[PDB]
Each structure stands twice: as C-alpha cells, then as structure tokens.
Amino acid sequence: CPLMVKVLDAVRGSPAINVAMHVFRKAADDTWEPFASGKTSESGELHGLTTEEEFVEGIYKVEIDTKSYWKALGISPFHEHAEVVFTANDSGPRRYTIAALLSPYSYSTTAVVTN
Amino acid sequence: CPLMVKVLDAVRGSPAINVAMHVFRKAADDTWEPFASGKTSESGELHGLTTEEEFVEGIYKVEIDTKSYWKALGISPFHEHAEVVFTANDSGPRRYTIAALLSPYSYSTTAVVTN
Amino acid sequence: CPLMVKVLDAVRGSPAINVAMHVFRKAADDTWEPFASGKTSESGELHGLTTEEEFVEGIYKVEIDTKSYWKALGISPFHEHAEVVFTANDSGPRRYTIAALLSPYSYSTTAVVTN
Amino acid sequence: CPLMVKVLDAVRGSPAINVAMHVFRKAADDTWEPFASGKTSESGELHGLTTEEEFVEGIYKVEIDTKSYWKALGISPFHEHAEVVFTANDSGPRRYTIAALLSPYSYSTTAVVTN
C-alpha cells in the first residue's frame, strides 16, 4: 500500500476496530478535497485507500473520528478527532504507514516511511 | 490561566522554545475564527492566551507550527503542524493544560483538565 | 530540585495523584541501592527526592508503581511498573525532570535535562 | 507468535533495525532468569522468541538495548535501556505484541493482547 493507517487502543490493549477516517488532499486554492475514506478492520488497519498512480506529491490530511470510538465504549473523550497533516514526499512516491495510539485524553501518532 | 500549552522536544531533552501556535474558535457559520496566538517561552510554555470571561463554551483548535521548529534545527519533519481540536467548557468553566511531545516523525498530545 | 518526577493519567485527563515510586542508585558491587522514595502530590509531582550534594554521578533507576494506581481505579493493567534507567551527572551536575504519561496498556516517559 | 516485539524510530520515521533485546522470567526466588533473546529484523520486528507450550503464566521482563541503537547513529541518549515488565495472563495463554517507539530522550511502549 502507498498509504496505510493502523490504530491502537491504549485503554483496552487492542486494535481499535471500526474506527472511521477520511483522507483529504489540499486543493490548489488551499481547500480540503475528499480523497479516500474507510473504517479500520478487526486488526485495527485500513488498507486500500489509494494507488501509486493516484498518490502524487501533495499535502494530505487524515482525520480519524476518535470521538465516536470512545463514545461507543461509554467514555467522554477530550478530542473531537485526531488529525495528521503531512506532505507526501517533495521528492516522488513512497510508502507511508501512519500509526495512531489512542487514549481518552491523549493520542500519539507516528509515521513509518519505508522503501 | 484557563488555557496553557507546554511543548517538549524528545530529541534534545529540552523544552521546545519559540514554537509558534495559533488558537481558533469555531464560529456560528462553522468557520474557524482566530482566537489567540503566541510563541513558547524558554520553559516551553505559552501562558496568557485568554481570560476566563472570553473563554466561552465552544470548539477550539490549537495549531502548533512544528515544521518551522524542526527545519530551524536542520531536520525535515513529517508533519506540517500538530493540531489539537476539542470542546471546551461544555459542563462549565474548566482550566486546560495541553502538553505536546515532539519528535520529527511522531508527536503525542495530552490534556489535563481541572475544575 | 535536581530530580523531579511528574505523572499524568491519560484516561482521566488528570495528574496521577498518590502514585508511589522508588529511586535506586547502582552501587559499586553492581546491585541497586535504595536512594529515595515518595508519592506524587495532588499536582502529580514528586519534589524533594535529593539534594545537589547527594546526587552524584551514577546510574539511577526510577520505579513507578503504576499497577497499584490502576488497580485502585478498578482496572487490571498490563505493566507491573514503569521503570526509567539513566546515567546522571556524567558531564557535570544537571537538573532532571522525568515525566510519565500513563494508560492501562501503554506508558510514555520523557526526560527534560537542564544545566 | 505467543510473544512478538516491534520497535520504531521516531527520529528517522523507520523501523528500528538490529536492536538487541533480552527476555527474562522471574524465578520463584525473585531473580531474573534468561528466557529468550534476539535482534530486530529489517521490519523492526522480533519473532520466534518462545512457543505456546513454554510461555506459561509468570512475570516477564523485556530489556531493549536502546542505548547501543542511538550510539550507532551518533546520538547520546538519555536511557540506558527500555524495560517492559508484565504478568503474562493470570488466566492462561494469550498472544502478546509489545510495541516500542524510540526517541533519544523519550520512549513509549504499548501492549496489544489479542486472541
């Protein structure tokens, strides 16, 4: 995959399953255009968001609906969502894995960029 | 201080000094209205963003310009910025400390909410 | 304060209050010698562990009893404790702040070192 | 795998490759007995540490030699190593993935416990 997202739940020690997210690409007029979306699987992963041909250099935003996830467990969380905004290489295609670790009042994100 | 932000640098083991950030409040037309801005001090903290009277219920966004911070140190980081989006004061006035821990390819953010 | 520890609770969005910890120093026979202990305050901080004169060069271990903290809240956590092992003062005296962010199945620890 | 470890580098945005670690099991006299060891692969993963039959309930310690990893990149890090101490279910076998995210002055660990 050019772009994969993995989401983990630090309260339960498990993948974060059925988490919805949307991916946007910054349009030339500096507005966010829908690009891809999906929900995580039972492994907490979302694959198949895009293809190499389609995933060109640009500024992308991944918006993860963490609030609905916590509300489903009966927890009132702090964040409205988790956002990850990045430039996809200013030097050609590459493979991006975005990981997100969720708690009700905290999240961390990392990127793994391999070849 | 109804709203304080603290930023740490996980590469150097230091406060993140002179990091710019912008705070926005979601307006009635569902656009982001600029609310406050500033830079962190030598302790990595930004105080004095707002008062109890001005900090009403609403949805707020804190945008931390992490890319300029890393670029000044010679590092091309992954994220364009770190964003924190949250509802504030929906059960009455609270005090919010937002902490952010920065690395070039990862960040964590954590909120402490006191009454 | 040559050595201070701050502990936050990522589930509740609060300082982690009344968390016990034990500090050890590696002795000449390569065993751990008990150095200092205490509990965090209502601000989640533990001050006053040592003085500049007593805090000599060496290898130190901070053991934070996170399991008792979670169990008191009804949660069976993953870790037995959180441990931080580091060399201190090997380039001369420094001030160390150790921060720990706790969730039941995850923790993060971060050091700020100032001269 | 009953027990797998994955290590990521938050400075470079990559798997942490060739990181050495040792696993210990607490002996009945409260001493740490060597149990397994290995180095991470090019994917930052270490598989094949143990088998279901051998991995019985107990207290285990994973000691990750993060200091050698950073020194190989020319960085003087804070921690001597990263330690993860846990009880392997007080209610039978299960599958454990331990993830560790490394920076020079910070690390985070999480556990994913699936069935």
Coordinates of C-alpha atoms in Angstrom, one line a residue:
Chain A
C1 CA 0.0 0.0 0.0
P2 CA 1.2 3.6 -0.7
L3 CA -0.8 4.6 2.4
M4 CA -1.9 2.5 5.3
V5 CA -3.3 3.6 8.8
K6 CA -3.1 1.5 11.9
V7 CA -5.0 2.5 15.1
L8 CA -4.4 1.0 18.6
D9 CA -6.4 1.4 21.8
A10 CA -4.2 2.0 24.9
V11 CA -7.1 1.6 27.4
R12 CA -8.0 -1.9 26.3
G13 CA -4.7 -3.1 24.8
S14 CA -6.3 -4.0 21.5
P15 CA -6.6 -2.8 17.9
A16 CA -9.1 0.0 17.5
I17 CA -11.8 -1.7 15.4
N18 CA -14.4 0.1 13.2
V19 CA -12.8 3.5 13.6
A20 CA -13.9 5.8 10.7
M21 CA -11.5 8.1 9.0
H22 CA -11.4 10.4 6.0
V23 CA -8.4 11.5 3.9
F24 CA -8.3 14.9 2.2
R25 CA -5.8 16.4 -0.3
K26 CA -5.1 20.2 -0.3
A27 CA -6.5 21.7 -3.5
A28 CA -4.6 24.4 -5.4
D29 CA -6.9 27.0 -3.8
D30 CA -5.9 25.8 -0.3
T31 CA -9.2 23.9 0.4
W32 CA -9.5 20.3 1.6
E33 CA -10.8 18.0 -1.1
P34 CA -12.1 14.5 -0.2
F35 CA -9.6 11.8 -1.3
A36 CA -10.3 8.5 0.4
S37 CA -12.1 7.1 3.4
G38 CA -12.8 3.9 5.3
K39 CA -13.1 2.2 8.6
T40 CA -10.5 0.1 10.4
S41 CA -10.7 -3.7 10.3
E42 CA -10.5 -6.2 13.2
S43 CA -6.7 -5.8 13.1
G44 CA -7.1 -2.0 13.5
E45 CA -5.8 -1.4 10.0
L46 CA -7.1 0.4 7.0
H47 CA -5.7 -0.7 3.6
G48 CA -6.5 0.2 0.0
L49 CA -7.0 3.9 0.4
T50 CA -5.2 4.8 -2.8
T51 CA -2.9 3.6 -5.6
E52 CA 0.6 4.5 -6.6
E53 CA -0.6 6.3 -9.7
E54 CA -3.1 8.4 -7.8
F55 CA -1.0 9.2 -4.8
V56 CA 1.1 12.2 -6.0
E57 CA 3.1 14.7 -4.1
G58 CA 0.9 17.0 -2.1
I59 CA -0.4 17.9 1.3
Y60 CA -2.7 15.4 2.8
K61 CA -4.9 15.3 6.0
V62 CA -6.0 12.1 7.7
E63 CA -9.0 12.9 10.1
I64 CA -9.7 10.0 12.5
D65 CA -13.1 10.0 14.2
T66 CA -11.8 9.1 17.7
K67 CA -14.8 10.7 19.5
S68 CA -17.3 8.2 18.1
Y69 CA -14.9 5.4 19.1
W70 CA -14.7 6.4 22.7
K71 CA -18.4 7.3 23.0
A72 CA -19.2 3.7 21.9
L73 CA -17.3 2.5 24.9
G74 CA -19.1 4.9 27.2
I75 CA -16.2 7.3 27.6
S76 CA -16.4 11.1 27.1
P77 CA -13.1 11.9 25.4
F78 CA -11.2 15.1 25.1
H79 CA -10.5 15.4 21.4
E80 CA -13.1 15.9 18.7
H81 CA -10.9 13.9 16.3
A82 CA -7.3 13.1 15.7
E83 CA -5.7 14.8 12.7
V84 CA -2.5 14.0 10.8
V85 CA -1.4 16.6 8.3
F86 CA 1.7 15.9 6.1
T87 CA 3.4 16.4 2.8
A88 CA 3.8 13.3 0.7
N89 CA 7.4 13.4 -0.4
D90 CA 8.5 16.5 -2.1
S91 CA 10.7 14.0 -3.9
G92 CA 8.5 11.3 -5.5
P93 CA 6.3 8.4 -4.4
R94 CA 7.0 6.4 -1.2
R95 CA 5.2 4.0 1.2
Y96 CA 3.6 5.6 4.3
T97 CA 2.3 3.9 7.4
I98 CA 0.6 6.2 9.9
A99 CA 0.1 4.7 13.3
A100 CA -2.1 6.2 16.0
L101 CA -2.3 5.2 19.6
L102 CA -5.5 6.4 21.3
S103 CA -6.4 7.2 25.0
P104 CA -9.4 9.3 26.1
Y105 CA -7.3 12.4 26.9
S106 CA -4.2 11.7 24.8
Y107 CA -3.1 10.4 21.4
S108 CA 0.2 9.9 19.7
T109 CA 0.9 9.4 16.1
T110 CA 3.9 8.3 14.3
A111 CA 4.8 7.8 10.6
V112 CA 6.9 5.0 9.2
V113 CA 8.2 5.8 5.8
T114 CA 9.9 2.7 4.1
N115 CA 11.0 1.8 0.6
Chain B
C1 CA -4.7 30.6 33.0
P2 CA -7.8 28.9 31.6
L3 CA -5.7 27.6 28.7
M4 CA -1.9 26.8 28.8
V5 CA 0.2 24.9 26.3
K6 CA 3.5 23.2 27.1
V7 CA 5.8 21.8 24.4
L8 CA 8.7 19.4 24.8
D9 CA 11.5 18.2 22.4
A10 CA 12.0 14.5 22.7
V11 CA 15.2 14.6 20.5
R12 CA 17.1 17.1 22.6
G13 CA 15.5 16.6 26.0
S14 CA 14.6 20.2 26.3
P15 CA 11.6 22.5 26.3
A16 CA 10.7 23.5 22.7
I17 CA 11.4 27.2 22.8
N18 CA 10.0 29.8 20.5
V19 CA 7.4 27.5 18.9
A20 CA 4.6 29.4 17.3
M21 CA 1.0 28.4 17.7
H22 CA -2.4 29.7 16.7
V23 CA -5.7 29.1 18.5
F24 CA -9.0 29.2 16.7
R25 CA -12.7 29.0 17.8
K26 CA -15.4 27.5 15.7
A27 CA -17.8 30.3 14.8
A28 CA -21.6 30.2 14.1
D29 CA -21.0 29.8 10.4
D30 CA -18.8 26.8 11.0
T31 CA -15.6 28.5 10.0
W32 CA -12.6 28.9 12.3
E33 CA -12.2 32.3 13.8
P34 CA -8.7 33.3 15.0
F35 CA -8.8 33.4 18.9
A36 CA -5.3 33.9 20.2
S37 CA -1.7 33.2 19.2
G38 CA 1.8 33.3 20.7
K39 CA 5.2 31.6 21.0
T40 CA 6.5 29.3 23.7
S41 CA 8.9 30.8 26.3
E42 CA 12.3 29.4 27.4
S43 CA 10.4 27.0 29.6
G44 CA 8.4 25.7 26.6
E45 CA 5.2 27.2 27.9
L46 CA 2.7 29.6 26.5
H47 CA 0.6 31.4 29.1
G48 CA -1.8 34.3 28.8
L49 CA -3.7 33.3 25.8
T50 CA -7.2 34.2 27.1
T51 CA -9.2 35.1 30.1
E52 CA -12.0 33.2 31.9
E53 CA -14.6 35.7 30.6
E54 CA -13.5 35.4 26.9
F55 CA -13.0 31.6 27.0
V56 CA -16.6 30.6 26.5
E57 CA -18.1 27.2 25.5
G58 CA -17.2 26.1 22.1
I59 CA -15.0 24.0 19.8
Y60 CA -11.4 25.2 19.8
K61 CA -8.4 24.3 17.6
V62 CA -4.7 24.7 18.7
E63 CA -2.4 24.6 15.7
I64 CA 1.3 24.2 16.7
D65 CA 3.9 25.1 14.0
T66 CA 6.2 22.1 14.5
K67 CA 7.5 22.2 10.9
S68 CA 9.3 25.5 11.4
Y69 CA 10.8 24.3 14.7
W70 CA 12.4 21.2 13.1
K71 CA 13.5 23.0 10.0
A72 CA 15.4 25.5 12.1
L73 CA 17.4 22.6 13.6
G74 CA 18.2 21.1 10.2
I75 CA 15.5 18.3 10.2
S76 CA 12.9 17.8 7.5
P77 CA 10.0 16.6 9.7
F78 CA 6.9 14.5 8.7
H79 CA 4.1 16.7 9.9
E80 CA 3.1 20.1 8.7
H81 CA 1.9 21.0 12.1
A82 CA 0.4 19.4 15.2
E83 CA -3.3 20.1 15.7
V84 CA -5.5 19.6 18.8
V85 CA -9.3 20.0 18.4
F86 CA -11.6 19.9 21.5
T87 CA -14.8 21.1 23.0
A88 CA -14.2 23.4 26.0
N89 CA -16.4 24.4 28.9
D90 CA -19.4 22.4 27.9
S91 CA -20.0 21.3 31.5
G92 CA -19.0 24.7 32.9
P93 CA -15.6 26.6 33.1
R94 CA -12.5 24.4 33.4
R95 CA -8.7 25.0 33.2
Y96 CA -7.0 23.2 30.4
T97 CA -3.3 22.3 30.1
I98 CA -2.4 20.9 26.6
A99 CA 1.0 19.2 26.5
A100 CA 2.7 18.2 23.3
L101 CA 5.8 15.9 23.0
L102 CA 7.6 16.4 19.7
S103 CA 9.9 14.2 17.5
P104 CA 10.5 14.6 13.8
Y105 CA 8.2 11.7 12.8
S106 CA 6.0 11.5 15.8
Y107 CA 4.1 13.6 18.3
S108 CA 1.9 13.0 21.3
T109 CA -0.6 15.3 22.8
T110 CA -2.1 15.1 26.3
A111 CA -4.7 17.2 28.1
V112 CA -5.0 17.8 31.8
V113 CA -8.5 19.3 32.7
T114 CA -9.0 20.7 36.2
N115 CA -12.1 22.2 37.9
Chain C
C1 CA 15.3 20.2 42.7
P2 CA 18.0 18.2 40.9
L3 CA 15.4 15.4 40.3
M4 CA 11.7 15.8 39.9
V5 CA 9.1 13.3 38.6
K6 CA 5.7 14.3 37.1
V7 CA 3.0 11.7 36.4
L8 CA -0.2 12.2 34.3
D9 CA -3.2 10.0 33.7
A10 CA -4.2 9.8 30.1
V11 CA -7.6 8.0 30.8
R12 CA -9.0 10.7 33.2
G13 CA -7.1 13.7 32.0
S14 CA -5.7 14.4 35.4
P15 CA -2.5 14.3 37.4
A16 CA -1.8 10.9 38.8
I17 CA -2.1 11.5 42.5
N18 CA -0.6 9.4 45.3
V19 CA 1.5 7.2 43.0
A20 CA 4.4 5.6 44.8
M21 CA 7.9 5.5 43.4
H22 CA 11.3 4.2 44.5
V23 CA 14.6 5.6 43.2
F24 CA 17.7 3.4 43.3
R25 CA 21.4 4.0 42.5
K26 CA 23.7 1.4 41.1
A27 CA 26.3 0.6 43.8
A28 CA 30.0 -0.5 43.4
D29 CA 29.0 -4.2 43.6
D30 CA 26.5 -3.7 40.7
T31 CA 23.5 -4.0 42.9
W32 CA 20.7 -1.5 43.2
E33 CA 20.9 0.6 46.4
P34 CA 17.7 2.3 47.6
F35 CA 18.3 6.1 47.2
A36 CA 14.9 7.9 47.7
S37 CA 11.2 7.3 47.6
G38 CA 7.9 9.2 47.8
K39 CA 4.4 9.6 46.5
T40 CA 3.1 12.1 44.0
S41 CA 1.2 15.1 45.3
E42 CA -2.2 16.4 44.1
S43 CA -0.4 18.0 41.2
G44 CA 1.1 14.7 40.1
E45 CA 4.6 15.8 41.1
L46 CA 7.2 14.4 43.4
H47 CA 9.8 17.0 44.6
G48 CA 12.4 16.9 47.3
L49 CA 13.9 13.5 46.5
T50 CA 17.5 14.5 46.8
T51 CA 20.0 17.4 47.1
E52 CA 22.6 18.6 44.7
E53 CA 25.4 17.3 47.1
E54 CA 23.9 13.8 47.4
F55 CA 23.0 13.4 43.7
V56 CA 26.4 12.3 42.4
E57 CA 27.4 10.7 39.1
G58 CA 26.0 7.3 38.6
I59 CA 23.3 5.1 37.1
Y60 CA 19.8 5.6 38.6
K61 CA 16.6 3.7 38.3
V62 CA 13.1 5.2 39.0
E63 CA 10.5 2.6 39.6
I64 CA 6.9 3.9 39.4
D65 CA 4.2 1.6 40.9
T66 CA 1.6 2.0 38.2
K67 CA -0.1 -1.3 38.9
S68 CA -1.4 -0.2 42.3
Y69 CA -2.6 3.0 40.7
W70 CA -4.7 1.3 38.1
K71 CA -6.0 -1.4 40.4
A72 CA -7.4 1.2 42.8
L73 CA -9.5 2.5 39.9
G74 CA -10.8 -0.9 39.1
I75 CA -8.5 -1.6 36.1
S76 CA -6.2 -4.6 35.7
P77 CA -3.3 -3.0 33.8
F78 CA -0.6 -4.6 31.7
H79 CA 2.6 -3.5 33.3
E80 CA 3.9 -4.3 36.7
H81 CA 5.5 -0.9 37.0
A82 CA 7.1 1.7 34.8
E83 CA 10.9 1.9 35.0
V84 CA 13.3 4.6 33.9
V85 CA 17.0 3.8 34.0
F86 CA 19.6 6.5 33.1
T87 CA 23.1 7.8 33.8
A88 CA 23.0 11.1 35.6
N89 CA 25.6 13.9 36.0
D90 CA 28.3 12.3 33.8
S91 CA 29.2 15.6 32.2
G92 CA 28.7 17.6 35.5
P93 CA 25.6 18.4 37.6
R94 CA 22.3 18.7 35.8
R95 CA 18.6 19.1 36.8
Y96 CA 16.4 16.3 35.6
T97 CA 12.6 16.3 35.1
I98 CA 11.2 12.8 34.3
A99 CA 7.6 12.9 33.0
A100 CA 5.5 9.8 32.7
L101 CA 2.1 9.5 30.8
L102 CA 0.1 6.5 31.9
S103 CA -2.6 4.4 30.3
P104 CA -3.6 0.8 31.3
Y105 CA -1.8 -0.8 28.4
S106 CA 0.7 1.9 27.5
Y107 CA 3.1 4.4 29.0
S108 CA 5.4 7.0 27.8
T109 CA 8.3 8.6 29.6
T110 CA 10.2 11.7 28.7
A111 CA 13.2 13.5 30.3
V112 CA 14.0 17.2 30.3
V113 CA 17.6 17.9 31.2
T114 CA 18.7 21.4 32.0
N115 CA 22.1 22.9 33.0
Chain D
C1 CA 3.6 -15.9 17.9
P2 CA 2.9 -16.0 21.6
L3 CA 5.2 -13.0 22.1
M4 CA 6.4 -10.5 19.4
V5 CA 8.2 -7.2 19.8
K6 CA 8.1 -4.3 17.3
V7 CA 10.4 -1.3 17.6
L8 CA 10.0 2.0 15.7
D9 CA 12.4 5.0 15.5
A10 CA 10.6 8.3 15.8
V11 CA 13.6 10.4 14.7
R12 CA 14.0 8.8 11.3
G13 CA 10.5 7.5 10.7
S14 CA 11.6 3.9 10.2
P15 CA 11.7 0.5 11.8
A16 CA 14.4 0.2 14.4
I17 CA 16.6 -2.4 12.8
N18 CA 19.2 -4.6 14.6
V19 CA 18.1 -3.6 18.1
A20 CA 19.1 -6.2 20.6
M21 CA 16.9 -7.4 23.4
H22 CA 16.8 -10.0 26.1
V23 CA 13.7 -11.5 27.8
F24 CA 13.8 -12.7 31.4
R25 CA 11.3 -14.7 33.5
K26 CA 11.1 -14.1 37.3
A27 CA 12.3 -17.2 39.1
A28 CA 10.5 -18.4 42.2
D29 CA 13.2 -16.8 44.3
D30 CA 12.5 -13.4 42.7
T31 CA 15.6 -13.3 40.4
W32 CA 15.6 -12.7 36.7
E33 CA 16.4 -15.9 34.7
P34 CA 17.3 -15.6 31.0
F35 CA 14.4 -16.8 28.8
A36 CA 14.9 -15.6 25.2
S37 CA 16.8 -13.0 23.1
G38 CA 17.3 -11.7 19.7
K39 CA 17.7 -8.7 17.4
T40 CA 15.1 -6.9 15.4
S41 CA 14.8 -7.6 11.6
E42 CA 14.6 -5.1 8.8
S43 CA 10.9 -4.6 9.6
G44 CA 11.8 -3.7 13.2
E45 CA 10.2 -7.0 14.4
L46 CA 11.4 -9.9 16.6
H47 CA 9.5 -13.1 16.1
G48 CA 10.1 -16.7 17.4
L49 CA 11.1 -15.8 21.0
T50 CA 9.0 -18.6 22.5
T51 CA 6.4 -21.3 22.0
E52 CA 2.9 -21.7 23.4
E53 CA 4.0 -24.7 25.5
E54 CA 6.9 -22.8 27.0
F55 CA 5.2 -19.5 27.6
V56 CA 3.4 -20.1 30.9
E57 CA 1.9 -17.6 33.3
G58 CA 4.6 -15.6 35.0
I59 CA 6.3 -12.2 35.3
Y60 CA 8.4 -11.4 32.3
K61 CA 10.9 -8.6 31.6
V62 CA 11.8 -7.4 28.1
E63 CA 15.0 -5.4 28.2
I64 CA 15.7 -3.4 24.9
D65 CA 19.2 -2.1 24.4
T66 CA 18.2 1.3 23.1
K67 CA 21.5 2.9 24.1
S68 CA 23.6 1.0 21.6
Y69 CA 21.0 1.8 18.9
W70 CA 21.3 5.6 19.4
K71 CA 25.0 5.5 19.8
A72 CA 25.3 3.8 16.4
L73 CA 23.6 6.9 14.9
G74 CA 25.9 9.3 16.8
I75 CA 23.3 10.3 19.4
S76 CA 23.9 10.3 23.1
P77 CA 20.6 9.2 24.5
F78 CA 19.0 9.5 28.0
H79 CA 18.0 6.0 28.8
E80 CA 20.4 3.1 29.5
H81 CA 17.7 0.7 28.1
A82 CA 14.0 0.4 27.8
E83 CA 12.3 -2.1 30.1
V84 CA 8.9 -3.6 29.9
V85 CA 7.8 -5.7 32.9
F86 CA 4.4 -7.5 32.8
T87 CA 2.5 -10.6 34.0
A88 CA 1.6 -13.0 31.3
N89 CA -2.1 -13.6 31.9
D90 CA -3.0 -14.7 35.4
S91 CA -5.7 -16.6 33.4
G92 CA -4.0 -18.8 30.7
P93 CA -2.0 -18.4 27.5
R94 CA -2.6 -15.5 25.1
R95 CA -0.9 -13.6 22.2
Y96 CA 1.2 -10.5 23.2
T97 CA 2.6 -7.9 20.9
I98 CA 4.8 -5.3 22.6
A99 CA 5.5 -2.2 20.6
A100 CA 8.1 0.4 21.5
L101 CA 8.5 3.8 19.9
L102 CA 12.0 5.3 20.5
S103 CA 13.4 8.9 20.7
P104 CA 16.7 9.9 22.3
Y105 CA 15.0 11.4 25.4
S106 CA 11.7 9.5 25.4
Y107 CA 10.1 6.2 24.7
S108 CA 6.6 4.8 24.7
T109 CA 5.6 1.3 24.9
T110 CA 2.2 -0.3 24.4
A111 CA 0.9 -3.9 24.5
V112 CA -1.6 -5.4 22.2
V113 CA -3.2 -8.5 23.6
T114 CA -5.3 -10.3 21.0
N115 CA -7.0 -13.8 20.7

